């Protein structure tokens, strides 16, 4: 996160980190035994660690939990990164409670101008790279869709949106992916991709969620 503050020890407690010997990509909880995060994050030996605050340090709170299984949506293009979700089933669920908790799924998408916050541990240079200890946040609006495909012509799908500042200097950024956009309590999107970190009118783009929804709730309720 470029440009974002201090979150605070558990104040964001539906974030997850994905663990393969370092952290590589963000996620959420959405129920004591899964967890969405961006397909392009895919690899195998996760392990998730819920209730982290600082990734380099154990200081209480943390529950690692190996991945079950990993799956990708099955219309995800590596290319254009259109349906850029996965979702992650747990071996064992977590215990929640106050410092880690589930996100709730979207009804409605979200429209230009909601106010999100946007969380991880990735990068917090737009020129370099400087990876943080502790947990970042991010207060963003989501833009409108004529800004979004102005900035990514011919980019952009009916599952994406972007979010962010055109002025740049506040973003998500590498580090950050598969993790969450949540605006009024809701999941709306999926830390996906961007043309560097905070530049000047390219927006970071996210996955939108509220077109998943019930790809999400069928997946799970299969697996
Ligand atoms: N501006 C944003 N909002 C943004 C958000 C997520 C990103 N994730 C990444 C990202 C970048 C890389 C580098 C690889 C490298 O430097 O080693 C690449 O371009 O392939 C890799 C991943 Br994988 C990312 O998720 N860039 C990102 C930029
Ligand atoms: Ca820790």
Not at 20 to 28: E, P, R, T
Not at 120 to 137: A, E, H, Q, R
Not at 200 to 212: A, D, E, I
Request: proline share 4%; with cysteine.
């Amino acid at each position: 996160i470029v440009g974002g503050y201090t979150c605070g020890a558990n104040t964001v407690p539906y974030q997850v980190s994905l663990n393969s010997g370092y952290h590589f990509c963000g996620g959420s909880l959405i129920n004591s035994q899964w967890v969405v995060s961006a397909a392009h994050c895919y690899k195998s030996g996760i392990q998730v660690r819920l209730g982290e605050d600082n990734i380099n340090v154990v200081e209480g709170n943390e529950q690692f939990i190996s991945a079950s299984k990993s799956i990708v949506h099955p219309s995800y293009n590596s290319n254009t990164l259109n349906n850029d979700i996965m979702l992650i089933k747990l071996k064992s669920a977590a215990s929640l409670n106050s410092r880690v908790a589930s996100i709730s799924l979207p009804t409605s998408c979200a429209s230009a101008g909601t106010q999100c916050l946007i969380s991880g541990w990735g990068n917090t240079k737009s020129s370099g790279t400087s990876y943080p200890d502790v947990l970042k946040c991010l207060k963003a609006p989501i833009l409108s869709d004529s800004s979004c495909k102005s900035a990514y012509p011919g980019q952009i799908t009916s599952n994406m949106f972007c979010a962010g500042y055109l002025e740049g200097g506040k973003d998500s950024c590498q580090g950050d992916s598969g993790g969450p956009v949540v605006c009024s309590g809701k999941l709306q999107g999926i830390v996906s991709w961007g043309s560097g970190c905070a530049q000047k009118n390219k927006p970071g783009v996210y996955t939108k969620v509220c077109n998943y929804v019930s790809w999400i709730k069928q997946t799970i309720a299969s697996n």
